Design a protein around this ligand. Sequence first.
Ligand SMILES: NC(=O)c1ccc[n+]([C@@H]2O[C@H](COP(=O)([O-])OP(=O)(O)OC[C@H]3O[C@@H](n4cnc5c(N)ncnc54)[C@H](O)[C@@H]3O)[C@@H](O)[C@H]2O)c1
Ligand SMILES: NC(=O)c1ccc[n+]([C@@H]2O[C@H](COP(=O)([O-])OP(=O)(O)OC[C@H]3O[C@@H](n4cnc5c(N)ncnc54)[C@H](O)[C@@H]3O)[C@@H](O)[C@H]2O)c1
Ligand SMILES: NC(=O)c1ccc[n+]([C@@H]2O[C@H](COP(=O)([O-])OP(=O)(O)OC[C@H]3O[C@@H](n4cnc5c(N)ncnc54)[C@H](O)[C@@H]3O)[C@@H](O)[C@H]2O)c1
Ligand SMILES: NC(=O)c1ccc[n+]([C@@H]2O[C@H](COP(=O)([O-])OP(=O)(O)OC[C@H]3O[C@@H](n4cnc5c(N)ncnc54)[C@H](O)[C@@H]3O)[C@@H](O)[C@H]2O)c1
Lengths: 342, 342, 342, 342
Amino acid sequence: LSLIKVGLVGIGAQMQENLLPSLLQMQDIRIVAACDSDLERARRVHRFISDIPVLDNVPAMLNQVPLDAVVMAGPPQLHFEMGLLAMSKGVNVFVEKPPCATLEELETLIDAARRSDVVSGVGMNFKFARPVRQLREMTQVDEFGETLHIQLNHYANKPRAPLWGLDSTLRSFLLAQAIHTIDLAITFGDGELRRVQSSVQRHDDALIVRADMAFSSGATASLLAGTSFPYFEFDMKLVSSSSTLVELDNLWNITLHEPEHATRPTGAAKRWRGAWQPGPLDSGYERSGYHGELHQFFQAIREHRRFEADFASLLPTYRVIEEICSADAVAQGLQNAHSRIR
Amino acid sequence: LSLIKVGLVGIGAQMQENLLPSLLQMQDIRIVAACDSDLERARRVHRFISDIPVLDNVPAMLNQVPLDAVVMAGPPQLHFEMGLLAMSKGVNVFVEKPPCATLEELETLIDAARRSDVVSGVGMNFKFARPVRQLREMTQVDEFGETLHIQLNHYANKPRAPLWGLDSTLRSFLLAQAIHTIDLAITFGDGELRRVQSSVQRHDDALIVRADMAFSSGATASLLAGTSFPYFEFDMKLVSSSSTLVELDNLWNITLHEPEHATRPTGAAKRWRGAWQPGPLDSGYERSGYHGELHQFFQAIREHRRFEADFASLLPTYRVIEEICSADAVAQGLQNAHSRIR
Amino acid sequence: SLSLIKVGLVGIGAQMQENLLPSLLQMQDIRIVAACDSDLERARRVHRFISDIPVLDNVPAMLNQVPLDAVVMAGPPQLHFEMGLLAMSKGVNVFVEKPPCATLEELETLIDAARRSDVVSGVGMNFKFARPVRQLREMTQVDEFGETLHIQLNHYANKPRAPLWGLDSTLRSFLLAQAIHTIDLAITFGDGELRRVQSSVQRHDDALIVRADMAFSSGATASLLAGTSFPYFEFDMKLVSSSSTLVELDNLWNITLHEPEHATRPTGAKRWRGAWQPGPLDSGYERSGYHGELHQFFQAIREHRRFEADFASLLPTYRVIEEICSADAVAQGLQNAHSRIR
Amino acid sequence: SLSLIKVGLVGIGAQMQENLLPSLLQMQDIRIVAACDSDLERARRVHRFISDIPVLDNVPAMLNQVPLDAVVMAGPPQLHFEMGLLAMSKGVNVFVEKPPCATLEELETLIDAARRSDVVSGVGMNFKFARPVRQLREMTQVDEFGETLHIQLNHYANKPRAPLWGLDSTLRSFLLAQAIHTIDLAITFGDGELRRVQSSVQRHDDALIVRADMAFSSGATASLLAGTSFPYFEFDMKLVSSSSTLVELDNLWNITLHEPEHATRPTGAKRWRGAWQPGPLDSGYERSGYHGELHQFFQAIREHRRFEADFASLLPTYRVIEEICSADAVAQGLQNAHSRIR
Ligand SMILES: NC(=O)c1ccc[n+]([C@@H]2O[C@H](COP(=O)([O-])OP(=O)(O)OC[C@H]3O[C@@H](n4cnc5c(N)ncnc54)[C@H](O)[C@@H]3O)[C@@H](O)[C@H]2O)c1
Ligand SMILES: NC(=O)c1ccc[n+]([C@@H]2O[C@H](COP(=O)([O-])OP(=O)(O)OC[C@H]3O[C@@H](n4cnc5c(N)ncnc54)[C@H](O)[C@@H]3O)[C@@H](O)[C@H]2O)c1
Ligand SMILES: NC(=O)c1ccc[n+]([C@@H]2O[C@H](COP(=O)([O-])OP(=O)(O)OC[C@H]3O[C@@H](n4cnc5c(N)ncnc54)[C@H](O)[C@@H]3O)[C@@H](O)[C@H]2O)c1
Ligand SMILES: NC(=O)c1ccc[n+]([C@@H]2O[C@H](COP(=O)([O-])OP(=O)(O)OC[C@H]3O[C@@H](n4cnc5c(N)ncnc54)[C@H](O)[C@@H]3O)[C@@H](O)[C@H]2O)c1
């Protein structure tokens, strides 16, 4: 296969922990430049690949190094600005979430993606996580019937203050975290988003966000998310029209509840379920989705088709984010005037 | 202690499986009559206690046998009609849920309870279940802070048709099942019910009900319930203002997530939680709540105080049931006219 | 219908009050007609449930004054042994909590007395009658399970850490108070005569850890880990069969069953397994075995058949127990002899 | 900064491609400079990641033509043994997958060669370096844990069910392919010299079940259950300490830690325990041990120190392995001799 030539931007924590390692073990791709404002961070790639250029700004990299793609892991502002620059030069663009800070910015990125006709992508790794893929495959099987209801629980401890210079801690949380689980909702909903209701509770610097979504397919989704928890954890469920209930705990173990489940020593006795977890030595970046999201991005480049987590795919997710922030602004407003008056 | 004299009504399945066994091992109470339309069912109590009267109708029992209390496990219609009769005779009344079929009937029972000044009770065993009690005790402890959010998941497979001659399968499900988990919501909400939103999805003869509740205390509750599942199961969670998350799975095991949990061999290392489950030989009727609900009912009689699950305590639960049925009737109506027209 | 079996209770302490008595109280067609205890106030506790029945402070007096068909005892083995012989000579059926006696030779006297008297004798070997143990035993008798090759038993406790009932040995006390249960489970699943036993004990302060391996003529092997070197009582076990089936039972609660080629309808595959646990409202005394051990004991009386946990049934377990104590004393004798040699 | 360590790969089959190679590719400051395989097309698979580097179909040729500091092998023990001696005589550091050889006597030749050549030698004993095993080992070195009294190891597999690498024995093949890992864990936690070993093997068709017990001079005992009589590879282990602490590690994933007087802030008590598992996005090769085994091997090269899984470190495990095969052949010799006597 022809080698895909990749330039890296923002060699910080998520680049070093997850993306770079995935790229390093990724077939038929070559990393040919690294860029970071702090050039010493860029040179971290020399620990793996000697000699390749390190640059302190993206424009220099785009001008000196021939590239089929850039993979970026920085702030929304980086992804937005340089994202547009890279696309304007005909380079395919993969960025960590969030791709940008606003719906209107996303619409700008979408429009540029279409005009430049390049493959775009966002690092929505939950979508590509092996156990999530397995669940998605279940929804395609006849005996599962239809997905009626999706429940998502997404715990985190931060952010407890605004990020990237945004005024709002809620908007920061939605873009830093909930973006993942809202997108999972849109993914399993499978059909057009038809209604969104939501609410936000605050306590000190902590948040609990509840969002409910209905889809044209008839399916509903409910998300509990926030920063009022000790650490990042994630659990989801699916309820199907054939009375199948599927639970995925921590992207690790699956529990499958269905009428008339059996084992051979017992036959179909009341209350048997199926359970599944990985083997003890499960490793790499598939279970977590980093491998999958990059692999498919590159594939979409090879066959010049759409990448499933391109900018446009995020359109419904940004609408939900916007709606969650608008409703909260109204709620806050009313409560503030209430008090001001009483 | 003086012996409390108890008459039983409706010696069917739930009486034989749970209540009668709890009464039989209950200190200082005496069963002194059994009543059932099918006298052979009433005589099932002769398997345990010889000679005591068996009657085929409640009025006969109230006229011939001196009683401090009746415990009933039949249809709502039995509980309502004979409930009022027993109270009119100055007898304390314990009935299985549902105590009746409508808000207006509950209001009638409440008013009679107050006029007769007797102890009333409903067999809301989830409230009294040992693990639920443990959770409630946690909410009373300073380091827990306040309960911000309560999540309840209540799976069942039935009813898939209307019960007790009601027109509505939804109302049957709400009274047969969800009554338990809605009441748990009101219990942990602790404060006045301030808003209720809800939705009902149908598929064939199966239902998925989603209800959200907000309390004056600031706390919110979300319930997922229905008959679109293989068997009865129940999971709940609490999110507290101190970033404590508490999970109770199947009234069996508890998981307690909190900042800086430790073990002695490790110190407070990232991602340690507390877990708790009963010992292997856990038995009787405490874990499940049947013991507790009856014990406290009898106690309320001894000290002539209120029983915590008396008729009045169910007032907010019936309001939610009514609201869920009203909203569904509107939704159905609109969808029916939509089609009729298109 | 059925005739009432008349039962006297001896030893109204903790195990009588927590499990046995409650079980008896809900048992069809038996009457508790007398309670006997050294401490007449303990005997009187029955009056919380059943008025007027005679209380005695010694077994001889109860046997003279009250017509009885069976006694049920929960005291020390000295009481089980002596009063159990006395009740049997008067043609009374005898049920005793473990342990029935302190020594193998005692057990042999018991066995002999019970054969000559032609009464039903029984020991409260409740693990053996526990509903999930029954489910495990049932799989074992099914062709596709194949043969049971290996049985792993893990029995944890925190006591006794001092000798019991005036015995000299903390090891003998532990084996008689705790391990007896799991040694007997091993015999029960081994199914075949005991061919070989190896054991060892490790001591640390007042705590111990016993390991014992058993081989059976059926080819099956068993391995047991038990001691007091733990925080609390817990129990897990495993079965390995010749169809490559592994069955795990954790705390008499959940069952995991691993077998080649397990499936779900939505996935058709590797690493799928079966899981089972009771419903949330599981209650009474079946799961723990107290109900079944008693119910079978009474059935055996009515049908004049052998009760499966009679004194004889315990012979192999007391053999194992002797062999562990002998071996240990030799290991101890050596270590001490090695030391006064240094 | 650091000098680049130059690595040749030998044996580009499944374990090289799934774990070792990906680990090497993300390893700071090492360069893969050659790949060697009988099947040049397998060798060429490296070119999916690193262009142009020489491919050879034999180790001798690679050692002549390419300057190397270390080789990393993943082939049969015959290859590890012979080519491992060859690489060591040329002053090349040698890392090989298990097993490093087929026999104890081979291992001794390896140990001797490695001492004379003064190079770092190593075996891919990855369980030992697995992050959760490290956590367990760390608790063990902490005063309050007390001493480790007992170690229980359960190692399940479905293969091999036929002899491997032209060996005659399916038992030797299994011990060398699988149990080697868990025998070595036992040695590692036993901490003290091996005092005693007992074992037994049971056969059923083409499957086996090995039990082995080990005692150590530190007082610690170990008990291991391993075989092929199971659906799939799984692994769980337990530590019992003298502070009455029990630690369980299930499938290198979750840790349960039982200790007297555990607590939560909201409950202050009996039956509380600690639990731990990784976050949902846990990835790479640390958890499984491939990362750490390699990283330490390279660190040992740089510091010219001993690598903890060198050939010598494996001596006790190969001793155990011989003793299990000897014992088994005697047990077999007897059963057959008993039979031609019948
Ligand atoms: N999908 C996942 O699971 C998840 C996990 C972690 C973070 N993320 C995302 O990854 C991204 C990066 O976060 P991080 O935690 O590694 O933070 P970081 O501060 O450690 O890394 C960001 C890097 O970008 C660089 N950068 C900033 N602007 C630049 C510019 N104009 N040109 C070149 N370099 C520039 C920084 O100097 C830095 O080294 C985010 O958008 C974040 O939300 C994804
Ligand atoms: N709380 C729990 O967990 C839960 C579990 C099971 C059922 N319940 C409740 O228990 C109650 C009884 O249900 P059941 O399942 O045992 O059904 P059932 O049909 O088996 O028992 C009802 C009994 O009441 C009798 N009855 C009816 N009307 C009577 C009358 N006018 N006078 C005397 N007897 C009369 C019947 O003949 C019968 O034997 C309900 O209201 C039900 O919803 C509670
Ligand atoms: N493992 C289990 O299945 C379960 C658990 C605990 C106890 N056991 C068994 O039950 C028995 C009692 O245990 P416990 O924990 O309830 O202790 P306990 O405090 O209940 O003592 C039992 C009773 O027997 C009485 N007694 C002693 N000698 C008597 C005599 N000569 N005549 C009449 N009464 C006499 C005592 O006064 C006392 O009230 C034991 O043998 C024990 O191992 C069963
Ligand atoms: N348990 C674990 O930690 C993990 C798991 C599986 C395998 N292992 C070990 O890794 C090794 C290989 O296992 P595999 O499953 O990857 O099988 P495999 O299909 O990968 O075979 C390994 C490779 O070595 C090559 N080879 C054989 N002899 C050679 C020679 N003389 N010169 C050059 N190349 C030669 C083969 O052609 C082949 O491509 C074993 O010794 C095994 O036990 C590690």
